[model samples]
Target: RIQNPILPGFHPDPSIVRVGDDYYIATSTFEWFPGVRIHHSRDLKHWRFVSSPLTRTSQLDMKGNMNSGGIWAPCLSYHDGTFYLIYTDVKQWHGAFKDAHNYLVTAQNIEGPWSDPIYLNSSGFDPSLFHDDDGRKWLVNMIWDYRKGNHPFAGIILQEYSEAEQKLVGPVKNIYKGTDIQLTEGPHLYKKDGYYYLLVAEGGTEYEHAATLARSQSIDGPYETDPSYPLVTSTGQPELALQKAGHGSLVETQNGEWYLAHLCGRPLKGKYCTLGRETAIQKVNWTEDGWLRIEDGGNHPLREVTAPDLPEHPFEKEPELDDFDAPQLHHQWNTLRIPADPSWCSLEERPGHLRLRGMESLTSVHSQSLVARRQQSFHCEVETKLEYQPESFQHMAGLVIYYDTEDHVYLHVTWHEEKGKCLQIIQTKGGNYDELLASPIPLAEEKAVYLKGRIHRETMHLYFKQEGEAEWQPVGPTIDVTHMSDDSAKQVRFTGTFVGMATQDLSGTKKPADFDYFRYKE
Candidate 1:
């Protein structure tokens, strides 16, 4: 049996596809810009970031909101050498119910000159696309059709896609309704061996979430549920155990093995998931009964497989040591939101470091247009060396534990008008927003300072050091992050999982700081 949860970290609602020998996958970013992060894998065991669909906030505006409302489920497909991504923009929720909607975008290459999102007039979430063998492309989604007044959130549907009109062709067909447990959302299609398969997510996408399967010979079907359904799930386990396993995408490797990529929650002991949902992989086999059975009982979250078989490919592991010495940004990083312009950030002239001018500093608990990475493990540490000398307004640069705007913690260095310079750790634990925890150490004038933090399960220890200091010193009291999980936050009225990282401010008087390097260890 392979390791149950393949890709750890904040990878949720995963959509996967394979091209010949290479496998590509993407996931929901939710208000976290550069939406829809794409990852590549050879063995399907070790994965690494390759690129993202959105480069700026202009792709989809998630300006000041967070939690389940940013970029929802995104579908990735490759046809005729062009990569097509059909996704939904949730920023419209802030304006009106009319604004809460979905959109589509495309690019010739994965590293894209991505086209702006083409709005799809659909009221739904988690949209997917299927390019069938008959040269037909179909759109599958979860929506509420007012005419039916039946509401589709608890059901699944399919409609024809017209390239010319850039919209779905026919009336939506209600194929499968997972209303049993309010089970529904994130529908994907697969046709294999003359069987048309409908893979739908069920449960609440929480501890009770699950993946179910049904098949029919026709595209529009009286789809039949597998006699043995709910193919994959983490339900029935303890609250602290892995739960909410659904929203899956299937892939066939070059070796002809089949696997499913989906979102699974890893809860801390007696707590909920604060790191959000993580991408998990499990081996899938077709039984003699012509039904599918996942490795083991598909009840546990961790799998113990050694590695997957991959065709000869380079760079098949996690990315380490980013020197930023290239002329452009590496695929490992992403910006929040699509910008009306790309000039908000760049690496054009600088070969090794990322530069951010900074228009805003994620000032709210909503969407903040800052660049960050997923916080995968509890024992990992993030460090960035930055120069905070600003020519104009006050400058802020440092590390953070980010989960939208309302929930996060930061150990930052800001220019102090009175003290010349200062180092402080800011937190939003009690929903009071930005509260300072430590602010005694003075930043060395005009010198680069190192900001770092260690995430040990539920506590975060912050530290910083002068360029010449022999060792790092503690910045504040250890922060109790036990409330970072979705289950815990429900007690306090916050939504989603928690992930951590560091960021830089480029929009202020500061010329983007030189981030020496970013390192993470399991």
Candidate 2:
């Protein structure tokens, strides 16, 4: 049996496609650099990070983008020997009108030298492309009604897309207004057995999330809704382990087996989703009447499901230890909001160390000198060894558990001219900052130190040790990190938590901190 949440951690809004024997899945990356994350798998049970298509700043500029406001759901598809990626850059989501821009990019290969984004209509969010059998393309997405007192999620719209003109053409039409459930979005169109199937995500992205279906004899739908709608959901099933199951994509295996890749989250204390939404797979079977349903014959998603009927193909898991000895950083590392500045981080200056030149504080979304990885497991430890001599209180370097500019915990070493060197733990909750703990570093001959953090369920702890110390000493009180989640965060949180190294030089000194190694283990 294969475990659920095939792609774990903050991998939400998944769009999957299969080509030949290989499979690729793309997930939304709101403010994280490399706008969307793509994973590859052959057997559907095991997967690995292949490459992120939006690596260059020219392709994606997320500067000043609020939390969860950069890249929304991406639709990845393949046709005529070329791969196509359609996505939306949501600059502002709150208020009367949403400022969203949709664009298309293509590549000859999955691991792409992708083409620059081609402008598409920003009619609404969650735009997708459908290639009809007769060699025509159509774009479908949610229609946002900006009129006062009007339903924001009015319905789903369809329009013809001209590849020759590289733009959307003709009249836009509203195809479906959705059944009882409001907020119907994330629409994808597919053709099967001479009928056009429209899959949609309904209800908010919380406990009420669900996947619904509609079918039509013609692509322009006077479509019929499934009698037993919400093909899959965990709506009222609070006792189930998997919650918020929706926003899915369909894929078919070489042997003609069908599967559904969707987004789901596991909560702690039955309410908080700190890990955010993750990618999960369920075996899909067509009913005798031609409707789709989960093979388990259940409404609630399962924690463990039977593996797909394909051979076992596994990829190597990421290494626990990342020794900064390579010329480039690993693909797993991500910077906040924008591409990493060459002047802020470097692997060449110091042959075996990751050199980070301090810049703005973590609270600054404009330019933060930080590199982090997603918090994939609840029971895991993260540790890093850093060498830095702080000349002033303005220069501090250490480890952090970050949710956004407003919510995070920082434990670092700084200098106070009068007090000498000190270690401090600071907490920022809902934009309010407080110093939780502080201690003076012992009179050590060396300036290097090891910083460690551990997360077990809802509690988190920080520790530190000097060079040659056999044991780690506690740096702060045990912290309850349940607030570092989508439901608890003060901001409009759509993304998940991250833990890694950060540095800031408020004094304009531009001092550098060197990290020997960073390690994470479950």
Candidate 3:
């Protein structure tokens, strides 16, 4: 049996495509740089991160983008030996208007020298491309209505796409006005056995999420809802292990087995989702009456399903330690709003050390000096060794558990004129900062300090050690990180938690901090 949440921790809105024997899944990357994380798998059980299509500044520019407002759902499709990726950049999602821009990029190889973005319609978000059996293509997305008091989710729109012209043509059509559920979006169309199938995500993306299907004989649909409208959903089943099971796409294996990949979340105490929406796979079986349903005949998502009929292919686990000895940072590392600034972070500056030039504070979404990885587990430890000479209290460097600019916990080292140097724990709740704990460090002979943070379920602890010391000294009281979840956060929250190294220079001095290594283990 394959474990549920096959792709976990902030990996949401998965779109899967199979080219020959290999399967590729692309998930949404909100504000993280090098957007649209793509993973490859041969057996569907074990997946490995391959490459991101939007690596250059030209392809992606998320500066000033709010958390969970950059890249929305991405559709990955293969046709006529070309791999196509279509996605939406949701620049403005609040207030009176949603400034969403959709684009298409293609490459002969999945590891891409991908062609430049071919501009698609900006009418709405969660756009997908469907290639018909007759060699024609179509683009489908939700139509966003900006008029006051009107439903933002107007309806699902469709238009024929011309590959030769590289644009959507023909008249725009509203295919389905949606069922009784509100906020119906994330649409994907498929053709199987002469019928066009339209799968849509209904209700909101939270606890009420659901997946519904409609079908029609023509490409443009006056589609009929299935007898089992919500083929899969966890709605009304708050006690289930998996919740918010919606926003899914289907794929058929070479052996003719079908599977559905959808976005779901696991909540901790108080019904808060700190790990964010994740990707889960459910085995799908077609009914004798030509309807799609979960193999178990249940409305709630399964926690474990039988594996696809293929050979086992497991990927190597990510290493615990990153020594900064390579020519470039690992693909797993990410920054906020934009790619890591070349002037701020360097792996080649000291050859064996990562030199980070302190920039604006983490409170600023602009150009903060921070690089982090998703916090994939509750029981995990993140430690780093840093050498820095702080000129003032405004300059700080250390490890952080970040949710956004407004919510985070920092365990850092800073210097005061009277205190010399000290290790402190700072907390930011709802954009308010508080120094939770502090201890002066004897800096007479020590030039470096090792900082560590451990998270066990709902609480976190901070520890530190001198350069030559073998023992780690506790630096702070146990912190309640339960508030750092989606339900407890004060602002708009859609992404998961992250643990990583961060540096800040409120004094505008741009002082540099060198980190010898970073290690994360569970």
Candidate 4:
């Protein structure tokens, strides 16, 4: 069976493409260092993390980008033996204006030393490129309007992209004005038979999200919305396990079956999802009237569905434990604001240990020594061993359950002035900081500690133990971490909770910390 969320954990605004027998899904990465995440699948049921294309600072520079203000929807498409990747580096996402810049990078192969980014107009966020049968390329994106009394989502705009010229030229036109379910965005253009099809997302990104379809005889203008409207949605359907189902892209399998890859969230309660927006797939049918509909005549996303009629091809699974043996950090580990550079993070320093030189504090948007991965499962355990000697109160390194700079839980070891080297539990909820422990656990002569985050759904308990200890002790009470979600305390939220290691040396002296191993198990 084809389970829902073929790609799980913080993978939102999916853009899928099929090349020969290979299927690739590209997803938005927000503030995380590597901009877009790509997963590969052959049979459409099992998938694996292949690569992240945006690796260097020249490609994507987000030093002071706010939370959820880095990478927006990324569109992946292939044409004429070249793979084109379109993305938006969102500088600002709040208030009246959305200061965004769109760019394009192409590669001969899916995983590659991609070419330098070519400047593309950033009229708005979600931008996609369409290749016509006549060999003409077109760019489409939702235009943002900041004028008074006008909604921000103006409509979807279209322009001609000249490959030889390496730029967008000619007149730009607003193709679709959107349906009644407002906040229209995430446009993907397709041509089938004799009509050009426009697939769009509507009704915000919350529980009322939907995927609306439209068709037109010409590439531009006089388009007609699907009489059935939303091709798929989970709006107002609380009983459905997959909520916030929208922002999808379409792809056809080699077996002549159509699939819709959309963003869906599995919330812990109400509409709070610790795992954030994931990628879900559903089979669809094209009616004789030229409209697309989900299979089984259902409008909501399913937890499981029918798989494509292809031979099952699976990749080897990744080991749960990372012993810091790899010369470079694994693809699963992501640094914040910047790529994992050797100056701040390295594995060659101590051979088998991962060394992180502490930089700015956790609240700073500039720089910090942190390596994290998405919290894919609720009932999973995250364990890490850290070797660090706190020289002062400004030095701290340990495991963290991080949602953003505003919301996170930290179990770190540092000097407490009076308590000497000690263990402390610090947490933040919507920018409000709190200390969970009454007093720090003084680790008199101990310089190493094993930290773990034992989480079960919404509740999480932090644990720790010194070196040579056979048993682990509770660092704090098990509290609800439902706030580490998209629909939590803050109004501006788009990312999910992450579990990994973080170090801070607020004194401006980049103190070093060594981690023996990091492990995560479902």
Name the candidate that leads on TM-score.
4
Whole-model alpha-carbon lDDT for candidate 2: 0.88
RMSD to the native, candidate 3? 1.4
lDDT (Cα, tens digit) per residue for candidate 2, span 47-113? 9998889877777889888778999999999999999999888899978887899989999988869
Q: Put down candidate 1 lDDT per residue, 1-522, tens digits, no spaces.
A: 345455566678889988766788898877666678788877776677878877756676665544556777789998878788988776543222423577788888777689987777566777888898888898888765434555436477778888788877778787777646564778888998888888888876777788888888898887888777788877786642456778888987766678888888767665457677878877787777666767664444444543456543456456655665776555555445444233545555444655555456554533233566666776777776665564333466667776644567877766556666777777776465654653446767867788777887777787888898889888788877755566665432223433323343544443465566566555
What ordering of candidates by lDDT runs from best to worst? 4, 2, 3, 1
Candidate 3: list runs displaced more than 4 Å: 438-445, 490-492
Look at candidate 2 and tell me the lDDT of residue 242: 81
Evaluated against the true structure, the overall lDDT of model 3 is 0.87
Task: Give the Cα-based TM-score of candidate 2 against the true structure.
Answer: 0.98
Question: Considering only N, C-alpha and C atoms within 3 Å, which residue pairs clash in candidate 3?
Answer: none
Ranking of all candidate structures by their TM-score, best first: 4, 2, 3, 1
Candidate 2's displacement at residue 146, Å, is 2.3
Decoy 1 TM-score against native: 0.85
Q: lDDT of all the models against the reference?
A: 0.68, 0.88, 0.87, 0.91
Off by over 4 Å in 4: none
Task: Report how far off residue 361 is in candidate 1 (Å).
Answer: 4.3
Question: What digit string (tens of lDDT, one per residue) describes model 3 on residues 262-347?
Answer: 99988888477778888999999998878898989877799898888898988899899999999799888898878886699999
Model 2 collision count:
0
Each prediction's number of clashing residue pairs: 41, 0, 0, 0
